[PDB]
Amino acid sequence: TKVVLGQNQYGKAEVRLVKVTRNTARHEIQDLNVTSQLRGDFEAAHTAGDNAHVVATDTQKNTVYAFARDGFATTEEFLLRLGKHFTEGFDWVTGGRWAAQQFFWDRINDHDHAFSRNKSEVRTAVLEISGSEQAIVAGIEGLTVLKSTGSEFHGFPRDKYTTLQETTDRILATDVSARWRYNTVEVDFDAVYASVRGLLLKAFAETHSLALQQTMYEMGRAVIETHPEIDEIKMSLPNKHHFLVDLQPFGQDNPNEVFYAADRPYGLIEATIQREGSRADHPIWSN
Amino acid sequence: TKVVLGQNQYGKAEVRLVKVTRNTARHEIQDLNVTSQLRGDFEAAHTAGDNAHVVATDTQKNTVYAFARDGFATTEEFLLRLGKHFTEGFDWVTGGRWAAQQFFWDRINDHDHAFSRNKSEVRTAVLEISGSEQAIVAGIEGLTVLKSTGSEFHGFPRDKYTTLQETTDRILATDVSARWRYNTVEVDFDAVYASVRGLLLKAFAETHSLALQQTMYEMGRAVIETHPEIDEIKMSLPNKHHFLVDLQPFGQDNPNEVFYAADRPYGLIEATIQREGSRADHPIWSN
Amino acid sequence: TKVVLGQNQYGKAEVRLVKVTRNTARHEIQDLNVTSQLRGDFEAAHTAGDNAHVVATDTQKNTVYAFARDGFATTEEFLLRLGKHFTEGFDWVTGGRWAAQQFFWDRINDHDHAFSRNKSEVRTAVLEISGSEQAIVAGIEGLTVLKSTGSEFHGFPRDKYTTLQETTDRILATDVSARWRYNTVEVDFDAVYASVRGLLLKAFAETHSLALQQTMYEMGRAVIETHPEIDEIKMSLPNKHHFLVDLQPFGQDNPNEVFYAADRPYGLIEATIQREGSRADHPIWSN
Amino acid sequence: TKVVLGQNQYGKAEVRLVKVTRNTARHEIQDLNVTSQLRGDFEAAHTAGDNAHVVATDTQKNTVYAFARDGFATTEEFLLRLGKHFTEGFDWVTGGRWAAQQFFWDRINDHDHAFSRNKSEVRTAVLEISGSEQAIVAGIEGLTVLKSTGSEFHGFPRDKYTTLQETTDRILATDVSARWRYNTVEVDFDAVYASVRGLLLKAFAETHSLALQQTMYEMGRAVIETHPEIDEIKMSLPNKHHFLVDLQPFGQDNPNEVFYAADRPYGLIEATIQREGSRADHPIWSN
Numbered sequence A, B, C, D: 001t002k003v004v005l006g007q008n009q010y011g012k013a014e015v016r017l018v019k020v021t022r023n024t025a026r027h028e029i030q031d032l033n034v035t036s037q038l039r040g041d042f043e044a045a046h047t048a049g050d051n052a053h054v055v056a057t058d059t060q061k062n063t064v065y066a067f068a069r070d071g072f073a074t075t076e077e078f079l080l081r082l083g084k085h086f087t088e089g090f091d092w093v094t095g096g097r098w099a100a101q102q103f104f105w106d107r108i109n110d111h112d113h114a115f116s117r118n119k120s121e122v123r124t125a126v127l128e129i130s131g132s133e134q135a136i137v138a139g140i141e142g143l144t145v146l147k148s149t150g151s152e153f154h155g156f157p158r159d160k161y162t163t164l165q166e167t168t169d170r171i172l173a174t175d176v177s178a179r180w181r182y183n184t185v186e187v188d189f190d191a192v193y194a195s196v197r198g199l200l201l202k203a204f205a206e207t208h209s210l211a212l213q214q215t216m217y218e219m220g221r222a223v224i225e226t227h228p229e230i231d232e233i234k235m236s237l238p239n240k241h242h243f244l245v246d247l248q249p250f251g252q253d254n255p256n257e258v259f260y261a262a263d264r265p266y267g268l269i270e271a272t273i274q275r276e277g278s279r280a281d282h283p284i285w286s287n
């Protein structure tokens, strides 16, 4: 009977930007994949196709490049500039979501202007503005890790559908996908990112794992305990199964040496670790 | 400050299942990619690695195959059986999230047991159980559509960074990604999915588009107006740009015939169309 | 000590082109992914960086779009025009390789200008020119098929590394990738493509498979025996394993009904079926 | 008329193996993606479905894991053992093709048994046996590199379809894909791979590029001149376009700082650099 326009947003996604800093012979590279989306009063655009309030996605894209010309210290600083621009520049635009993936490059033998991609991880940043408030979530993804031992899994309940054998020595491999929310915008973004990355890696490697859930809890705890500016961290860790191959059919034993790395299916353990007393469900997680 | 375990869930993801129905010589094929995750009291598993409450992800996987043996009418009904099983079977398991992608197959020349994959779209279903509440969201993805005409875009504000020109004839191409939430589990799931797919395609094709936002609104309205069992539908539609190539430098015109289909960037228009008065932010959308 | 420039080629790869035919209200869509590479005397370009003979890849790109404006009967006809243009338009260019992927679209409810992608298969074409000689290879890929029965596999040798049990009833699933070489350019390309596709599907479905190798042989035989303009057809067929899940542990049985579709590893069966007397190793297969 | 079985091969593709060396607390990891295909007399398998000569692909897979138990010094040595086993172990198997991708891992803070994946490049190896002849090709792929300056492109011919402006300062970005053929099995495979990688990177970075063709030529020349065990090296280098954004409409200049990194299309330059007088078209390149 009665239809209503609910939450909505729009903009330009995946604007690939490469900013070269070359004021001197020592060139610097910043490589981003940027997405911009606006929120506000776009009722008529949807119900009547009246585009008076529709800042073209093409325009949003042009703005990303125009702002890049001035340079930016960090990815987060760049997103903050964009968000402020759109929200304050148009009265009907009350907020939005600006995100970016940051790709890393290393110099080729310390060369001044020749680099190679470091594809071992991807950094992410998301800024959400709502009225007079804003929140930032930083993250890391695509970071694959593995422990060849120091991982166990036993003591689980058994039912008629249970066939898994307990173990005190197995491989624990996963893809680190973590995202943390800052409780302030006054942060040394690059320093905290480097710190968090190291904390996650350290907790993963040094925690004698009795469960993937436990390892994840330790990784999250290390981050919250170390950085006051972080209120919560969310992680999604797949348990990439490395099956110990049965070689007895061929007359050989397998002392935890030969494994089959299966693609699918995979365990998927996810959790939110929070600072006691912090917000329970911030809107930025809705996406 | 102290660290606290917040929202969390775990299970087996992407369990690929193929169920063949062969009671008669006329075989039937059901092809699914299933994910199972439980929610409940898993505090100890995280803080101490105590797995007493941890129904192994391997066990969850076995349960999917065991249940498939009995057959299932629809993907949603299969998920409902799984969800009820885990929630009712373990006191500490209070709910969960079960999802699946359904892949379509067509018979080869009406053959009794030879088929070919229809890859033009993928059907999805997500079930979330919270206590006695059962919420289901069905959807479609990977369905690419295009209108060669019947699309315009003008009347947008021209700010200092706007270079896009107004037009009364352009291509409108997108990938239909839609998800709708049922307000009841007593639905003819297959019939509604077919109807919804048809309504979306119809609105996309017959609406003279003045904006992607308008086309999306009409698609959503048609669904809600036609199906009382649906409370809301959310869509995420990219505007996959097909740029009219400028051939004038080569001494030729281009009467809306030759286009360059760009990969990135792309416009991304998203919105929720709701039945007036329905729930604003159902938890199932958080994932 | 002494180095020599061997085989070489360069050009523009993956030029996405969409050609709309709209002389009438009944629009038509041709969607291609085109690649152009030239061969000839580019010695100086490599050893000295002398670009006198280097027709810019950007120029090759522009040519694709400029030629598309005139329209084309089939993809092969389009590649023929491009190859002729480059080899004859430049003295130092003696040949090249022009290829394309063709994507299929279906009308939405028979609409005049609204379509949806048929992603169930991708058509390919490759043209190679060498001096005054040219050859065309057409193909199909991405077409997934499956037989739920009518497939056996027994009688294979059993060495100390063999554990596979023989069977007279298993699922046979694969992705049809086939390419065939024409012995003449005067062909009804569209009609032959549709015919070949049908013959491959028919042979796959109606052949009681004793081995994937036999099924493939029968598929290729059908093609060669049906089309005089085809001298050989090459196929690469993966055996996408669907494992019968063991349900005995759950007190059940599995009468060829419940399967686990594994991603990797997979069997890979490949072969060339040719017309007796035809060329053994045509250069076009080198790429 | 008369149909004949031509070249053919079959086996198991993409067997994911992880071999852990743990004789001491200092664990080592070897991660491979292995493919095994046999060649020989398989006539009856194709024409009659007689599997007497068909060593099951499952058996080939089992052999890979059983052989891994004994360990291997290098990927090439591992493939060599496999090839000899199958050709020598079965009279009707006269040759084959064994290949593998090798994935790299780095220790986490020098941990004894905790690692993270180095996804910046993938090492490859292919062995082909044809009767008494053996040939090995090693390679590297997925290595993305970029020069922010030190690249020019001018002096190219200009026809009616040329719009590209000459330049003396542009970005040169590509994905390094190279494969080289050894002329002997007496090679320190790991040492040569590390050396070739360094030579390719060094040549790419230090060569003032007047054309991608020239840069590639220098990369190849360096490898051949340095390693007597290599007879030829083939490269496929895309020119991943980074377009200098025009900000003049906004009254801003862009001194080679802000770029748009386009996905497709892309230039694709390929060449073979050979030791003078070596084999022109070795069969291994055909696949």
Ligand SMILES: NC(=O)NC(NC(N)=O)C(=O)[O-]
Binding pocket: A054, A055, A056, A057, A058, A059, B153, B164, B210, B211, B212, B213, B239, B266, B267, B268, B269
């Ligand atoms: N907003 C639109 O309907 N058209 C589009 N055009 C713009 N905004 O540049 C888009 O990308 O979706």
Ligand SMILES: NC(=O)NC(NC(N)=O)C(=O)[O-]
Binding pocket: A153, A164, A210, A211, A212, A213, A239, A266, A267, A268, A269, B011, B055, B056, B057, B058, B059
């Ligand atoms: N539950 C399991 O079968 N094992 C797993 N390991 C855990 N939960 O620590 C996993 O996630 O696959």
Ligand SMILES: NC(=O)NC(NC(N)=O)C(=O)[O-]
Binding pocket: C153, C164, C210, C211, C212, C213, C238, C239, C266, C267, C268, C269, D054, D055, D056, D057, D058, D059
């Ligand atoms: N060769 C076959 O027909 N069947 C297959 N089964 C084996 N060889 O294990 C396969 O993988 O293709």
Ligand SMILES: NC(=O)NC(NC(N)=O)C(=O)[O-]
Binding pocket: C054, C055, C056, C057, C058, C059, D153, D164, D210, D211, D212, D213, D238, D239, D266, D267, D268, D269
């Ligand atoms: N040939 C070149 O060196 N640069 C390129 N630029 C052209 N040819 O337009 C390319 O795409 O490879």
